[PDB]
Design an enzyme around this catalytic site. Structure first.
Site, PDB file in Angstrom:
ATOM      1  N   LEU A 279      -1.565 -45.128  48.106  1.00 41.11           N
ATOM      2  CA  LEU A 279      -0.553 -45.592  46.835  1.00 41.11           C
ATOM      3  C   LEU A 279      -1.887 -45.755  45.557  1.00 41.11           C
ATOM      4  O   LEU A 279      -1.330 -45.515  44.487  1.00 41.11           O
ATOM      5  CB  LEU A 279       0.184 -46.775  46.993  1.00 41.11           C
ATOM      6  CG  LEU A 279       1.292 -46.799  47.706  1.00 41.11           C
ATOM      7  CD1 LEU A 279       2.083 -48.128  48.114  1.00 41.11           C
ATOM      8  CD2 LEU A 279       2.245 -45.811  47.608  1.00 41.11           C
ATOM      9  N   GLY A 280      -2.880 -46.340  45.885  1.00 40.17           N
ATOM     10  CA  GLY A 280      -3.899 -46.435  44.840  1.00 40.17           C
ATOM     11  C   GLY A 280      -5.081 -46.970  45.526  1.00 40.17           C
ATOM     12  O   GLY A 280      -5.199 -47.556  46.558  1.00 40.17           O
TER      13      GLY A 280
ATOM     14  N   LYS B 146      -8.025 -50.985  49.270  1.00 37.48           N
ATOM     15  CA  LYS B 146      -7.057 -49.974  48.902  1.00 37.48           C
ATOM     16  C   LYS B 146      -5.534 -50.253  49.189  1.00 37.48           C
ATOM     17  O   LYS B 146      -5.279 -51.274  50.046  1.00 37.48           O
ATOM     18  CB  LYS B 146      -7.392 -48.634  49.580  1.00 37.48           C
ATOM     19  CG  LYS B 146      -7.234 -48.793  51.151  1.00 37.48           C
ATOM     20  CD  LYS B 146      -7.173 -47.474  52.047  1.00 37.48           C
ATOM     21  CE  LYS B 146      -7.565 -47.569  53.284  1.00 37.48           C
ATOM     22  NZ  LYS B 146      -7.331 -46.310  53.989  1.00 37.48           N
ATOM     23  N   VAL B 147      -4.757 -49.656  48.680  1.00 36.75           N
ATOM     24  CA  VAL B 147      -3.354 -49.830  48.746  1.00 36.75           C
ATOM     25  C   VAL B 147      -2.301 -48.739  49.204  1.00 36.75           C
ATOM     26  O   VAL B 147      -2.602 -47.758  48.866  1.00 36.75           O
ATOM     27  CB  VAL B 147      -2.395 -50.412  47.452  1.00 36.75           C
ATOM     28  CG1 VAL B 147      -1.036 -50.637  47.709  1.00 36.75           C
ATOM     29  CG2 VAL B 147      -3.230 -51.553  46.842  1.00 36.75           C
TER      30      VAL B 147
ATOM     31  N   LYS C 136      -2.231 -53.880  51.339  1.00 31.80           N
ATOM     32  CA  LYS C 136      -3.343 -53.733  50.790  1.00 31.80           C
ATOM     33  C   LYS C 136      -4.638 -54.334  51.720  1.00 31.80           C
ATOM     34  O   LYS C 136      -4.324 -55.581  52.072  1.00 31.80           O
ATOM     35  CB  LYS C 136      -3.303 -54.801  49.542  1.00 31.80           C
ATOM     36  CG  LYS C 136      -4.581 -54.705  48.576  1.00 31.80           C
ATOM     37  CD  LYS C 136      -4.323 -55.398  47.134  1.00 31.80           C
ATOM     38  CE  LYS C 136      -5.214 -54.841  46.124  1.00 31.80           C
ATOM     39  NZ  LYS C 136      -5.095 -55.472  44.930  1.00 31.80           N
TER      40      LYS C 136
ATOM     41  N   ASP D 238      -6.973 -57.446  34.421  1.00 32.07           N
ATOM     42  CA  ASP D 238      -6.724 -55.863  34.898  1.00 32.07           C
ATOM     43  C   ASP D 238      -5.457 -55.246  34.429  1.00 32.07           C
ATOM     44  O   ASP D 238      -4.917 -54.488  35.004  1.00 32.07           O
ATOM     45  CB  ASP D 238      -7.051 -55.926  36.382  1.00 32.07           C
ATOM     46  CG  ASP D 238      -7.209 -54.326  36.910  1.00 32.07           C
ATOM     47  OD1 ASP D 238      -7.702 -53.586  35.938  1.00 32.07           O
ATOM     48  OD2 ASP D 238      -6.931 -54.088  38.218  1.00 32.07           O
TER      49      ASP D 238
HETATM   50  C1  6TE Z   1       0.852 -48.022  42.884  1.00 37.29           C
HETATM   51  N1  6TE Z   1       1.062 -49.344  43.524  1.00 37.29           N
HETATM   52  C2  6TE Z   1       2.246 -49.582  44.241  1.00 37.29           C
HETATM   53  N2  6TE Z   1       3.063 -48.562  44.050  1.00 37.29           N
HETATM   54  C3  6TE Z   1       4.299 -48.612  44.775  1.00 37.29           C
HETATM   55  N3  6TE Z   1       4.780 -49.787  45.523  1.00 37.29           N
HETATM   56  C4  6TE Z   1       3.779 -51.037  45.211  1.00 37.29           C
HETATM   57  N4  6TE Z   1       4.010 -52.269  45.732  1.00 37.29           N
HETATM   58  C5  6TE Z   1       2.864 -53.020  45.586  1.00 37.29           C
HETATM   59  C6  6TE Z   1       1.954 -52.019  44.880  1.00 37.29           C
HETATM   60  C7  6TE Z   1       2.305 -50.953  44.705  1.00 37.29           C
HETATM   61  C8  6TE Z   1      -0.055 -50.255  43.608  1.00 37.29           C
HETATM   62  C9  6TE Z   1      -1.453 -49.761  43.638  1.00 37.29           C
HETATM   63  C10 6TE Z   1      -2.037 -50.559  42.558  1.00 37.29           C
HETATM   64  N5  6TE Z   1      -2.894 -49.704  41.643  1.00 37.29           N
HETATM   65  S1  6TE Z   1      -4.531 -50.217  41.760  1.00 37.29           S
HETATM   66  C11 6TE Z   1      -5.028 -49.286  43.099  1.00 37.29           C
HETATM   67  O1  6TE Z   1      -4.866 -49.374  40.428  1.00 37.29           O
HETATM   68  O2  6TE Z   1      -4.612 -51.410  41.809  1.00 37.29           O
HETATM   69  C12 6TE Z   1      -0.394 -50.949  42.125  1.00 37.29           C
END
Ligand code: 6TE
Length: 278
Positions: A15-16, A17-18, A37, A127
């Site tokens: 998703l992004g 680690k996530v 995460k 951030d």
């Molecule tokens: C995109 N994202 C999410 N996307 C969908 N559903 C979610 N529930 C929680 C997060 C999340 C997260 C990765 C974080 N961004 S980063 C890596 O730049 O720190 C934000």
């Protein structure tokens, strides 16, 4: 009823680690989709983020679901709700058509509410960028990552960060870049930049990094922060996006006063945007 078994979390995509996982204890793929995460050593940091998120309960803040233990009960994972529309950084380019200024201003209000709530609990986000603002629906946004969030000590106006970790320098206020000091007013600065992104529909060509790099010019690396401080000292700022009304820019410029004490508050921002809607 807030514990997730690691063997049951089936990974789907990063998703992004996530990572996007499906928590499926029944094994019939009916299980619910969740954001997970984990660490790519800094377990103490993720534990702090978990304590922070568990303690946040707000409409414009991503819901804490629970925790997953990595054996021998030596590792931890943060479980959050999954918002399929993703971040503003990925959503806005895909929907430049349905999202007008009214809708962008409602998002700005929501981010400010989420941030004011964060401020009242004595935390600095450090951030706030569009990549961290999630889309629940076309009508609702949530602050979705708290990985750099720190609690401001009682009787103090800021938190000092003295580490070898990375920083989103193109979203940072002068005091953060110069003294590593993070105030609620520094988050206000980052909101201003986040609002710029949102107004430019997160166009990569107009990103704060792309624009500032074009202002600063050919730069290493180790000299980026100094060149950026110098540019900000001269009074240069991200330009008003095309067809952005004066009233919004004036609020955006109030987030960008060089001195923290001269910036607007998240509450003054809420009221300011709300006065522009209908
Ligand atoms: C995109 N994202 C999410 N996307 C969908 N559903 C979610 N529930 C929680 C997060 C999340 C997260 C990765 C974080 N961004 S980063 C890596 O730049 O720190 C934000």
């Amino acid at each position: 009823p807030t514990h997730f078994e690691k063997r049951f979390l089936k990974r789907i995509r990063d998703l992004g680690k996530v990572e996007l996982c499906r928590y499926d204890p029944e094994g019939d793929n009916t299980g619910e989709q969740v954001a997970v995460k984990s660490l790519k050593n800094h377990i103490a940091d993720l534990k702090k983020e978990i304590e922070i998120l568990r303690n946040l309960y707000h409409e414009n803040i991503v819901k804490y679901k629970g925790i997953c233990t990595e054996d021998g009960g030596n590792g931890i994972k943060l479980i959050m709700e999954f918002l399929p529309s993703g971040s503003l950084k990925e959503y806005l380019p895909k929907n430049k058509n349905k999202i007008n200024l009214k809708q962008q201003l409602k998002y700005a209000v929501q981010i400010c509410k989420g941030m004011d709530y964060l401020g009242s609990r004595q935390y600095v986000h450090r951030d706030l960028a569009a990549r961290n603002v999630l889309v629940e629906s076309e009508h609702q946004v949530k602050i979705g990552d708290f990985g750099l969030t720190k609690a401001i000590e009682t009787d103090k106006e800021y938190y000092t960060v003295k580490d070898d970790r990375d920083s989103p320098v193109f979203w940072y206020a002068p005091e953060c870049l110069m003294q590593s000091k993070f105030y609620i007013a520094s988050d206000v600065w980052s909101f201003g930049v986040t609002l710029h992104e949102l107004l430019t529909y997160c166009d990569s060509d107009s990103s704060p990094m792309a624009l500032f790099l074009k202002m600063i010019g050919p730069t290493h690396g180790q000299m980026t922060v100094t060149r950026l401080v110098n540019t900000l000292k001269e009074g240069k700022r991200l330009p008003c996006p095309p067809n952005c009304p004066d009233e919004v820019y004036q609020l955006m410029r109030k987030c960008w006063e060089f001195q923290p004490s001269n910036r607007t508050s998240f509450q003054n921002l809420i009221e300011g945007f709300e006065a522009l809607l209908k």
